[PDB]
Amino acid sequence: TLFGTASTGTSLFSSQNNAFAQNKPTGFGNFGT
Amino acid sequence: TLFGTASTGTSLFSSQNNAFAQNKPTGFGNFGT
Amino acid sequence: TLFGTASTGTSLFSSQNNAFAQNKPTGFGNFGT
Amino acid sequence: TLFGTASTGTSLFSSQNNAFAQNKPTGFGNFGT
Amino acid sequence: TLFGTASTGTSLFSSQNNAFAQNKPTGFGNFGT
Amino acid sequence: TLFGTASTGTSLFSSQNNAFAQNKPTGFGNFGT
Amino acid sequence: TLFGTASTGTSLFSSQNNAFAQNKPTGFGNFGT
Amino acid sequence: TLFGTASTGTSLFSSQNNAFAQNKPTGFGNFGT
Amino acid sequence: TLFGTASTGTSLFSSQNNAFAQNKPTGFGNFGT
Amino acid sequence: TLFGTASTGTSLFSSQNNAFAQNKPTGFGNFGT
Amino acid sequence: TLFGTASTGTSLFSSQNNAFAQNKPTGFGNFGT
């Protein structure tokens, strides 16, 4: 009754977001001007 | 009764978002101007 | 009663989003102006 | 009673979205202006 | 009744955000001008 | 006795190469394996 | 007796190469494996 | 007897190479594995 | 008898290389594994 | 008998290399593993 | 008989290398493992 094990490797500029219960997770937003 | 193990490798500029219960996950949004 | 193991390799600029229960997952959105 | 193992390789600019129960998954949306 | 163990490796400029109950987690926001 | 002003707009994955005297300019070459 | 002003705008992943005298300019080469 | 002014704007992951006399300028080369 | 003024703006992950006399300038080379 | 003034602005992770006489200038090389 | 004035602004993680006579200048090399 669980997620499990989620990994990443050798990744430049990288964001993971881990939860049991996420509401609206996001990838980056706003780079540059 | 679970997700399992989800991995990535050697990926530039990479975002994964892992949950048991996601609502509206997203990839990047807003780069540039 | 599970997903299994979903991986990626050697992928530039890459987002995966993993869940047991996704609602409206998305790929990138908004690059450029 | 499961998905199985779905992988990708050597793919530029690539998004996979993995779930047991997806509602409305999407590929990219909004690049350019 | 848990998440599990989610790790990352050898990742430049990287933010993970881990919770049992996230509301609106985010990746970076605002780089540049 | 000149080229003039050559511009591009809102173009994904784009290379222009500008010169007074080009010899063998090229577009991309080698993507994938 | 000149090139002029060559600009680009809002272009993802973009390389221009500007010279008075180019020999063999190139666009990208080698992405992936 | 000159190039002129060559600019770029709001471009993700971008390389320009400017010279009076270029020999073999290049765009990216080798991303991924 | 000159290049002129070559500028860039609001560009993520960007390399320009400027000279009066370039031999073999290059864009990135080797990201990932 | 000169280059001129070459500038950049608001650029994340950026390398310019300026000379009167360059031999083999380079952009990044080796990120990741 | 000179380069001129080459500047940069508001650039995260940035290396310029300036000379009258460069041999093999380089951008970063070796980040990660």
Numbering used by the authors:
A (entry chain D), B (entry chain F), C (entry chain H), D (entry chain J), E (entry chain B), F (entry chain K), ...: 87 to 119
Sentences from the study reporting this entry:
The human nucleoporin Nup98 forms fusion proteins in certain types of malignant leukaemia, is a critical component of the permeability barrier of the nuclear pore complex and is mislocalized in cytosolic deposits in Alzheimer’s disease. Key to these Nup98 activities is its large FG-repeat domain with a high number of FG motifs. The most aggregation-prone segment comprises residues 85–124 (named Nup98FG85). All four fibril types display a parallel in-register β-structure comprising short and kinked β-strands.
To gain insight into the molecular organization of cohesive FG-repeat interactions, Nup98FG85 was allowed to aggregate in pure water. EM revealed the formation of well-defined and mostly separated amyloid fibrils. Using cryo-EM, we determined the structures of four different fibril polymorphs (pm1–pm4). The least populated polymorph, pm4, was reconstructed at a resolution of 3.4 Å and contains two protofilaments related by an approximate 21 screw symmetry. The most common motif shared by the four polymorphs is a 13-residue β-turn/β-arch structure. A leucine-phenylalanine pair (L91-F92) is located at the tip of the β-turn, with both side chains pointing away from the turn. The other LF motifs in the four fibril structures show a very similar structure. In all four Nup98FG85 fibril structures, side chains stacked along the fibril axes build glutamine and asparagine ladders (top). Most of the stabilizing interactions arise where there are clusters of two to four phenylalanine rings and one or more leucine side chains. We obtained values of approximately −20 kcal mol–1 per chain for the four Nup98FG85 fibril structures.
